[PDB]
Design a protein around this motif. Sequence first.
Motif, PDB file in Angstrom:
ATOM      1  N   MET A 167       0.846  -1.186   0.000  1.00  0.00           N
ATOM      2  CA  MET A 167       0.000   0.000   0.000  1.00  0.00           C
ATOM      3  C   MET A 167       0.882   1.237   0.000  1.00  0.00           C
ATOM      4  O   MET A 167       1.888   1.290   0.712  1.00  0.00           O
ATOM      5  CB  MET A 167      -0.905   0.022   1.240  1.00  0.00           C
ATOM      6  N   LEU A 181      -0.878  -2.830   4.110  1.00  0.00           N
ATOM      7  CA  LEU A 181      -2.074  -2.489   4.870  1.00  0.00           C
ATOM      8  C   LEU A 181      -2.073  -3.215   6.212  1.00  0.00           C
ATOM      9  O   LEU A 181      -2.402  -2.629   7.243  1.00  0.00           O
ATOM     10  CB  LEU A 181      -3.326  -2.795   4.045  1.00  0.00           C
ATOM     11  N   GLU A 184       0.085  -1.365   8.742  1.00  0.00           N
ATOM     12  CA  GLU A 184      -0.536  -0.170   9.308  1.00  0.00           C
ATOM     13  C   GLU A 184      -1.562  -0.520  10.380  1.00  0.00           C
ATOM     14  O   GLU A 184      -1.749   0.244  11.336  1.00  0.00           O
ATOM     15  CB  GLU A 184      -1.152   0.682   8.202  1.00  0.00           C
ATOM     16  N   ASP A 276      -8.270   7.188  10.669  1.00  0.00           N
ATOM     17  CA  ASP A 276      -7.492   6.614   9.575  1.00  0.00           C
ATOM     18  C   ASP A 276      -8.348   5.682   8.726  1.00  0.00           C
ATOM     19  O   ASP A 276      -8.256   5.702   7.491  1.00  0.00           O
ATOM     20  CB  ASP A 276      -6.263   5.878  10.111  1.00  0.00           C
ATOM     21  N   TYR A 280      -9.142   5.599   4.798  1.00  0.00           N
ATOM     22  CA  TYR A 280      -8.967   4.484   3.866  1.00  0.00           C
ATOM     23  C   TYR A 280     -10.263   4.169   3.128  1.00  0.00           C
ATOM     24  O   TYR A 280     -10.239   3.820   1.945  1.00  0.00           O
ATOM     25  CB  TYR A 280      -8.438   3.244   4.597  1.00  0.00           C
ATOM     26  N   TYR A 285     -10.119   2.035  -0.346  1.00  0.00           N
ATOM     27  CA  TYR A 285      -9.259   0.898  -0.052  1.00  0.00           C
ATOM     28  C   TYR A 285     -10.006  -0.238   0.628  1.00  0.00           C
ATOM     29  O   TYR A 285      -9.556  -1.386   0.566  1.00  0.00           O
ATOM     30  CB  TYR A 285      -8.097   1.344   0.830  1.00  0.00           C
ATOM     31  N   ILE A 366      -6.116  -0.040  -4.195  1.00  0.00           N
ATOM     32  CA  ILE A 366      -4.814   0.031  -3.536  1.00  0.00           C
ATOM     33  C   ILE A 366      -3.697  -0.101  -4.560  1.00  0.00           C
ATOM     34  O   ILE A 366      -2.748   0.690  -4.572  1.00  0.00           O
ATOM     35  CB  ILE A 366      -4.710  -1.039  -2.440  1.00  0.00           C
TER      36      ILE A 366
ATOM     37  N   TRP B 325      -2.964   9.158   8.924  1.00  0.00           N
ATOM     38  CA  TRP B 325      -2.324   8.097   8.125  1.00  0.00           C
ATOM     39  C   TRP B 325      -0.904   7.864   8.639  1.00  0.00           C
ATOM     40  O   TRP B 325      -0.720   7.680   9.851  1.00  0.00           O
ATOM     41  CB  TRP B 325      -2.442   8.390   6.637  1.00  0.00           C
TER      42      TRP B 325
END
Lengths: 432, 432, 432, 432
Positions: A167, A181, A184, A276, A280, A285, A366, B325
């Motif tokens: 990503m 991803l 994160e 967040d 996304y 995403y 993505i 992010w």
Amino acid sequence: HMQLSSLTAVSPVDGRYAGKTSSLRPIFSEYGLIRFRVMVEVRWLQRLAAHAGIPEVAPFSAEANALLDSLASDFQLEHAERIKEIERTTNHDVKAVEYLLKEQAAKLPELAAVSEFIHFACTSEDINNLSHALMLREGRDSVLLPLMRQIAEAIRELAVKLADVPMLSRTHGQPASPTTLGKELANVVYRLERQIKQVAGIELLGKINGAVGNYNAHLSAYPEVDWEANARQFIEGDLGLTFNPYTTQIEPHDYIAELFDAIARFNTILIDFDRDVWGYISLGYFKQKTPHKVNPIDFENSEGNLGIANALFQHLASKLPISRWQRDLTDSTVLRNLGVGIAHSIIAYEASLKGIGKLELNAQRIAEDLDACWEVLAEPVQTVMRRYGVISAEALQTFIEELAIPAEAKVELKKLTPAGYVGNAAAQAKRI
Amino acid sequence: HMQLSSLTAVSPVDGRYAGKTSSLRPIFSEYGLIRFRVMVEVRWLQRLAAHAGIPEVAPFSAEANALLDSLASDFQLEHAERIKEIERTTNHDVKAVEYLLKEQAAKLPELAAVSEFIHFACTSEDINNLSHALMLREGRDSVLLPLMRQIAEAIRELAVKLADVPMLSRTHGQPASPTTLGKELANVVYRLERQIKQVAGIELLGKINGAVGNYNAHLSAYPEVDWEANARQFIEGDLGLTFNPYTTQIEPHDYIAELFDAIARFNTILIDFDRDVWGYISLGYFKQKTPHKVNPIDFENSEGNLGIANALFQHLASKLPISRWQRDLTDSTVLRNLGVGIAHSIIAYEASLKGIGKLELNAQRIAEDLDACWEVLAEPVQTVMRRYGVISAEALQTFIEELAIPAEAKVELKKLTPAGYVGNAAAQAKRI
Amino acid sequence: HMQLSSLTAVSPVDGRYAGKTSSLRPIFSEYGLIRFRVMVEVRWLQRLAAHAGIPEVAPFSAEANALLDSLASDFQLEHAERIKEIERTTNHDVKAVEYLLKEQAAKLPELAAVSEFIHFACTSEDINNLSHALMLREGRDSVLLPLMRQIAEAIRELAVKLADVPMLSRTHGQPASPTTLGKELANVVYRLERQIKQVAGIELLGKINGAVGNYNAHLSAYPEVDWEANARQFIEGDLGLTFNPYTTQIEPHDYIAELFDAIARFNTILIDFDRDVWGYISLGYFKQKTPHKVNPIDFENSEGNLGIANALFQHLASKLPISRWQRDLTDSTVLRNLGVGIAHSIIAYEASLKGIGKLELNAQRIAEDLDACWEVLAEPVQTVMRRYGVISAEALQTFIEELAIPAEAKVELKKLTPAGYVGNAAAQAKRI
Amino acid sequence: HMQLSSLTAVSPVDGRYAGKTSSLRPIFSEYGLIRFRVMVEVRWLQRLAAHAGIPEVAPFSAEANALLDSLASDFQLEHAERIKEIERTTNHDVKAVEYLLKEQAAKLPELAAVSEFIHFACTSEDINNLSHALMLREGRDSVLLPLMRQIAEAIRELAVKLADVPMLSRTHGQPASPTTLGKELANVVYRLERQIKQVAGIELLGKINGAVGNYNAHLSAYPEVDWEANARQFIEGDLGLTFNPYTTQIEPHDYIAELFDAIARFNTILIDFDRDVWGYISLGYFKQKTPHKVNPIDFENSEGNLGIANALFQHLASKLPISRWQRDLTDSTVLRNLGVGIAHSIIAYEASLKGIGKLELNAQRIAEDLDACWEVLAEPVQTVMRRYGVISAEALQTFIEELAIPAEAKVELKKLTPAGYVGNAAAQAKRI
């Protein structure tokens, strides 16, 4: 005038979200406060019965302990209703608990004989502070921590599932070196679990020492009894709390600030996650399971409730530990709200869990952003050039071949693509 | 336009209270930030020199290490001034640190040969986050904690000195069972020392992992090096911090919230103390040393500054750990204020210490209130009556003699006076 | 020990951002406080000279007024330095102002003759509260409001410029009925200007009434003088402030809460703007002038500083108006920070202005998102169908022609495109 | 699982204090939200019926308006219960209101004929924002302001009653120039009434403009109708609110911050009063009516609830006006708490009123402190000496007679006593 129900409740804790907060009704409501006051008074009488230095209270028979144990571990709504009725005459809530226990003790001559030792040498705050600690313990251990761990594990499952999904990163909102991803998401698990450990580790402090902290009344009646040792045995041994040896009339409430500060830190991480994930989703995403867009309402409801929870936690942490001289009574009304920040927290945790369960990867979006960003490969080329003392896929092949680097380095550099430039994100994500 | 001095400074941190905050200038100012950035960069280069997997940086001679160590442990104002001048050309503060080190490295061919490994594979936040942790460590360990412990010990000394001084308690502002003045001070020591332990125990977290947390650049240039093991060795071994294994571009700042929450809890206890002492002064229980009234200004200045400190601590704790992010840059400007809440705290600690040093007992006023309150003896009489199943000094002697209690109990009860009804306050105070 | 400079300042107000806050040095620093204290004392003496009921102070000659007016309207740094030196002997800051004026009065026999009427019947807070109001007035009118209006006008200019640029809306982060970029900016102007009006309209309150609010000393010396009328004339007529007729020793500070609440509301709107613009940059809707990405650092620096400003504003608004009995002195140290929230505000305003000046439309990205979202046309089709009782461009032409609506409606509906479905956004934007 | 009642409610708003907050059940609960949503939808349909440019909705007969008016002005609990049942099928709360109105419209062919114009061109937030403004209007005007004015008038009555009662002032807790007890109460009235005026003057803003603020849907169906003029007529004329011409999908909520900031300022003054009265009780200056001490519990309960109210007001004011792009949905859950800060406020106002009604002067204690403080007469003697260019009652007579002042001044000065040195406190108090 309107009858109270969830439809007419002023606060959404007992209104719109009544179904999300019902697990706190046995704990933090007035019923819960009454329940724990009864428990503390019963256990105190049992402590005196077990204490050989208090011969006026002899050990109880199985029959007498059965009645007492039923009040302390199988408390019924009818007992709390009776206490509310008694309070109409006493005009004092702890005194109403004492009178309920005296009414119950009247059922057995063995208990009636020691009815005057109910609440012996106690001040109201001896009962209240232990009740508050026991309420916080049950709320923390049976409601709050299980939901916190559910969130951590739900995010962990998704982090491992998505560990290999490359990503594009965004720093200051703009393209940055790629990640995965799953990585994160793993970052969030690690932060949440640090705070879970801190929440679980807070000492829940209690005292039982009379009107002003000095056992004055106890020592006038029983000068030969070690009341400090008895208090530590009662609090640590009988009740399973942590002893606070220095207090005034009140337990000073620092540990409540400690606990609320820790919950608030967990909540801040969850706000960051909610925002967040909202981002996304806005990027496409994630999509809806079973592309159909996923509506981020659950993350937004969570985010809103976490902010309210933290505002209440901050106020109680800042205000409760200030009390004029040997105490003022401003804490009494405030402590009726111990469950309100917890309620907004668990509303948010349930909402975050619901939102997490709706998330499905949209791999096409993505990959689209990653392939459209070959500029992220300038960093690895510069770093390799720097080691040896020295955009498009077609331009990268001709640029690398002209570099004064070992041919083995050019072979690996020429294979570089944005989706491949993830460092060790996947290995870090998999072991979270 | 007015030249900057303490007289013209907008904030009283560097203005009216400049003399109280000067110990933070080497730490939290831009000079301090620059100082620690230089330290981190120097130590990073030394780490690469020691790492056999990075042969391009060989171990340094004593001569080269002498120069590097001077920058990292004997930093001069002139170096920071030079960095500010360099920043005029770089338009980037961390890049200016890199260029200063490159200028210094040019002095020795051995260092010039590896000048391109200064900042190798680093992102700006690798340097910044370690700098912030080192700034917080020095501020906490060398400035904040010593003052916190000075307060605890100053109050302890007074608590022991006054352990035997009986004093009327006040609950909801009104007479209550007696205590001793030393006991009321000892209660504060115990609370403060709990928070000191928590402040000292916060882990100060650091990371060094490149642009987004995944060692992307490091692994492109040196795929065979265990960069995670190197990062933990650098952070825990070389720098003496605690390793944070999961981050984005930034270290997430949760530990800063933990530290600021703990300092704020200490400060709340000190506000409570400042206000209680203001009250004891208003009652005339303390007077001026060497009756001359003591002006409570030092306690009031402390109280005002603690409130400001806590407002800043709350904001930084709530806001820093939210970052969009893989990060937004709102934290950069906010982290320039890491020392401001600490500054208001140490202003307050110095003021509280000054006020404590002015306090002298006014025994006459304390005794006057106690002797005028024989109503406090109803509690011990009731408790003794309760044990055995059953106002003025003259009335107490006739009332007690008519009670159906053992004669030994009447002898002790008849000797009761308000100043004697202190429970075990004195023994608790003496052992604080 | 390190000498104070912007490099070594602990707070970034006088450190990193010293150049952005220098306009507050004449106002909110200790110099500014001293400057306004001198002004108030000079004007008070001139008021007594003009008052026929105070014959002991006769009207001043042009020569004497020239000296006094120079101190009150051409104050020099040397006078403030002298006051700081005098304070070493007085140990009292307002008393040092009195002595400076007595030293200046000694230069002219006419002024020396009435030197004992400097500060006549005043308490320190009579001087301080008027100084604070005058400091807030100059800060608000000469620094804060001009920058606030600059922001409103800069956004207005961009709103009008971009009034016709169609843009996809995003609600809960996802596509919604279109607007124009200029309309979204105009919305911000309208909100900001409401708060500007509120900031400008706050009454800045002052009092001058002696030790506790009741003119006790004034009436003992001059029982026949209407001191309340004199106070209103001094405050409203001579100083241009608003009179507060009921106070204790202090002016109660409610108006400071009013002013800080209004600035905080402006700042909240600006945070919202900073974050929305950060989002539009992340979408690529703006690019760099003269596509080159625009770095949103100025919006992020603004956002960070606005949060700090608001935390300080909230604390001062909440704490200042609480003062024990006829006052405690906790407000004295806190009021030294009147300019700190203002400083963080103006740092943010300058940063927002800088960021606004970098913004240039990237029409290609805006049009790309709009054309890719024909789903936004379901709403107008449904509404037209609803009026008459009843996706792609090709599918829309065949669907509309089959509807039981007037042919004139089908002609307009068939011309619908996402970029055309903006309602009256452009007309609203143009007239902001 | 426990059934919901006031005994089991988690929040004390609907629990311990249910009887104090019941007046908010028709307003801020989900019932109240539903009630006002129904009102807005009914009035919107009536607006279209009256609008000649919307011929599809003709004017309603008396019979049809009777039904509609009953829903909008005589709303029944059964309608809200039905909406909750409908929401089980719609999964959308505003849509459930629409369907209830469609079910009611089905009762009359005249209304059934235009059932598709219920909610015509509206977005959910068009209904919600007007509902919130109407809820705040009723809460402010019918519950909050009446209680605020009751407090002001109750304190005014006591201020006038006690206007002539001399009282020692305390600054920094220590003796200061005398005042009257009535004057100290009058100061509070003046502050409270300033905030009452501000609370009453806040504009309550509303909008009705479709999905994103631009009347897109309205103009597609009715391009010739002036929808902005219609919206202002509906909001200002039909509903009695203030028009907000520039919005996104949401009304931006700045006015809610304005209102909550004003209530919070009133509450801060009341905290100050609650604490000062607690102090006067601690001094024995007030006693119980009908000396019996007065227990200050009502002031303490008020103080505790005001702090909670203000924490919620601050959070909602700070958070509500930030909403991502054309809106995020975090405000929806937060706005369910509009009544919670108001609830804690009215709990506190009732408690303060109860405490005020218990206060009776204890003149003996007040006079005792005043007569024991002849040091307060140094100020008037110094001021009189200063006018003419120059402790015990016996010492004052000999000191004054030796002064070089006019004999008329010595006659008045020699009559000075502490209780007489009150300035014009009594006249100021009487005219409050």
